[PDB]
């Protein structure tokens, strides 16, 4: 038994950084003493750019190829394919990816902060709820001192469907007293296709203002 994955670029990389990449991730549920051959191909037959393996903490090999794509190329509807030459499945793997074509909706941003819990005076947890957007592709970021907090620092759920047509995520961010006793304002950013202008919706959030 064995699966593989191919992930669209990050709204951030695409719309803002303007250098989107897709990644083909293959999870091997038991690695054999051979190589894996991740091959890239465009549905047009145009040349793919040059693309960019790890032992997991349970003896499973996880190898990921990061192919950088064209900004315009992607947005216009180019289909990208991942062909993985595996030594254990009778034939190959054909994972394929393209721009999700249908309705738009701009995301709703909400940022809160947790009330004080006794014995944790030095830290608080800020929540952000980003909802009613579509398609599911969205990038979520936290800001301070008008520089962006690194990715590890917070944790954002996989987009789930809402009761209606939208999608929603929550982002959770623990902050030290040092941080909010410098500038007591933290911005929750969401880069989404439908968000205008400049593909951005953001809320600002204060620990007891």
């Amino acid at each position: 038994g064995v699966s593989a994955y191919l992930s669209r670029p990050s709204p951030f990389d695409l719309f803002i950084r303007k250098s989107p990449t897709i990644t083909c991730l293959v999870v091997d549920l038991a690695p054999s003493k051979g190589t894996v051959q991740l091959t890239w191909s465009r549905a047009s037959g145009k040349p793919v750019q040059h693309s960019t393996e790890e032992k997991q903490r349970n003896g499973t090999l996880t190898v990921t190829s990061t192919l950088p794509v064209g900004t315009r190329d992607w947005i216009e509807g180019e289909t990208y394919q991942c062909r993985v030459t595996h030594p254990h499945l009778p034939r190959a793997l054909m994972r394929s990816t393209t721009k999700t074509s249908g309705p738009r909706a701009a995301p709703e941003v909400y940022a809160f902060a947790t009330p004080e819990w006794p014995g944790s005076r030095d830290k608080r947890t800020l929540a952000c709820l980003i909802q009613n957007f579509m398609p599911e592709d969205i990038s979520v970021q936290w800001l301070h001192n008008e520089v962006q907090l690194p990715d590890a620092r917070h944790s954002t759920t996989q987009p789930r469907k809402t009761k209606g047509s939208g999608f929603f995520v929550f982002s959770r961010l623990e902050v030290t007293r040092a941080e909010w006793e410098q500038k007591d304002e933290f911005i929750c950013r969401a880069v989404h296709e439908a968000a205008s202008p400049s593909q951005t919706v953001q809320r600002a959030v204060s620990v007891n203002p």
Binding site: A43, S44, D73, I75, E76, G77, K99, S101, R104, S196
Partner: protein, 135 residues
């Protein structure tokens, strides 16, 4: 100095050359085709330009060089130019989404926004025609 020289298989009109390609292509695949033919998808700017194309336009429908950077919400020709001339069919653009960040031309020459992954049997390229020194 007169401009009407076209390379073979290109039909001229005023100062541009026009190629009317055929084959099931998506919009972006329609885009590629014209680059490889050293032109670009068509950019319609004059009602006269539209009249000329309407008479060569596939009745199945054609792909034209109109779409948006998304980071817009506004349509723009593949040459970079804005929309001065428009030939919108009734009800169209249904855009704001929908969808349908790509503009297609019906048999009637009328424009309508259809999805980009949608496949159509024809597309129209253009390029600048070349000219001839005076004597």
């Amino acid at each position: 100095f007169v401009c009407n020289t076209c390379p073979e298989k290109w039909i001229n009109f005023q100062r541009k050359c026009y190629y009317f390609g055929k084959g099931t292509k998506q919009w972006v695949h329609a885009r590629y085709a014209c680059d490889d033919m050293e032109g670009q998808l068509v950019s319609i700017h004059s009602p006269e330009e539209q009249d000329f194309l309407t008479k060569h336009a596939s009745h199945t429908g054609s792909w034209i060089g109109l779409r948006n950077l998304d980071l817009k919400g506004e349509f723009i020709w593949v040459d970079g130019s804005h929309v001065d001339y428009s030939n919108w069919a009734p009800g169209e653009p249904t855009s704001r989404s929908q969808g349908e960040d790509c503009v297609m031309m019906r048999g009637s020459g009328r424009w309508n926004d259809a999805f980009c992954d949608r496949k159509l049997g024809a597309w129209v390229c253009d390029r600048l025609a070349t000219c001839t020194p005076p004597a």
